Nucleic acid binder design. Sequence first.
DNA 1: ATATGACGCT
DNA 2: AGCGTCAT
Length: 431
Amino acid sequence: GPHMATGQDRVVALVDMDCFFVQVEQRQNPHLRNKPCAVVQYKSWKGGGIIAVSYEARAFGVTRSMWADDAKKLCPDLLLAQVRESRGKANLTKYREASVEVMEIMSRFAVIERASIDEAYVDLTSAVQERLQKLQGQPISADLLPSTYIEGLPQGPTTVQKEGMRKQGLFQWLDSLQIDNLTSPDLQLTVGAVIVEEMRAAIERETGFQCSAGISHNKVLAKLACGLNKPNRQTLVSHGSVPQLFSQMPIRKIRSLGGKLGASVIEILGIEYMGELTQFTESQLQSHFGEKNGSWLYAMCRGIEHDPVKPRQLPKTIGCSKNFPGKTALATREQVQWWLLQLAQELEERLTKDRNDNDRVATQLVVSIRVQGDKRLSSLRRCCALTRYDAHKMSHDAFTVIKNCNTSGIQTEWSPPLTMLFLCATKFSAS
DNA sequence: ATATGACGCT
DNA sequence: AGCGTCAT
Ligand SMILES: Nc1ncnc2c1ncn2[C@H]1C[C@H](O)[C@@H](COP(=O)(O)NP(=O)(O)OP(=O)(O)O)O1
Ligand SMILES: [Mg+2]
Ligand SMILES: [Mg+2]
């Protein structure tokens, strides 16, 4: 009772850009704004695979991973923008640079952890306290949170509109706030949400990009909260909202549970929602899923998670990959050498950029391949030393460490055909 | 036939 | 080290 830890010791946020690749193209081309539009790679095969969808196009049913020709059937007025192609492969330089614009603005407010190209976690714990002493006891007006939803609110007896429902929840939340108390976790989330409103106001104002965000006590709840009110809104998930939120929250919606372990949690325990995990003791969950998973599950279903926000705005690896599906699979020794050079050339261009910008050198190269028929994403991984940022040496050394896999007695041929080539620069050191 | 990045297990 | 899982 008096000695229970509720996991209310941190204020963690997850900011995620709304249809990021689309917004990047819409800022560059005004004709694409406020219209159903999507981003595609490789216009040849069925018009190109869609990798980002605007919300105007999502209303028609256009989704990611869909072929552009199929998406034109659902949305005939759909506009398209192609990803730049360099050396025969997709080139995402325009979006990595747009990412750095946002990451540097978020870095001004608090420590962030780059989670993807369009999202980063934030640890607002140190920023919330210093803001609390600056507001010497004065309350928080709703004008400081013009786009914040309070998950679970409004409730009970006192509108039909979406935005009307938002403020009544914020009103109930603010009216019950304990500003008398600086050790109140619910007050810390509110100050954290005020800061995120300022961060997101700075992002849109200095880049033109809109984003959603989640504010809670850990990374998992923040990411879940971020998806509740997209687009362009932030959601506060408090500790008290967890039981009702998790009572019907599918297990797959929780981070790290959308894969196989989440499936076995559903099958073995025979449950549907995240809240049903509270019935089980920790030893039971440890016996079914291991000591790490059982401990993590037992605390997560109660809204408690301890994975810290690592101060890391830079990637740990720099890699280049390209798939060769179907009959396009590389089957000649000349093809494999040529594409390894194309990958190594772009890799050098990115590594030299990384060494001048970020003062570090990659020290080893990882070569990954997939053969025709193998189900796993990777079929084989071999590694060597990355001494020079030389595209011809890297591609040559990459070929040296994979030429054994060629089960073809012929010199000029390559069997089995290669489905994917992948070079990855890892193991950085200060330069 | 939809290019990447972080991390755990052994 | 090499493979597997999870994610955008
Ligand atoms: N499977 C994939 N293939 C290629 N590119 C992808 C991808 N997933 C993401 N991207 C690229 C394209 C995306 O623009 C960006 C982030 O994708 P999200 O954050 O998962 N979803 P979005 O930001 O598009 O909209 P919203 O967050 O409101 O749902 O990374
Ligand atoms: Mg996004
Ligand atoms: Mg995202």
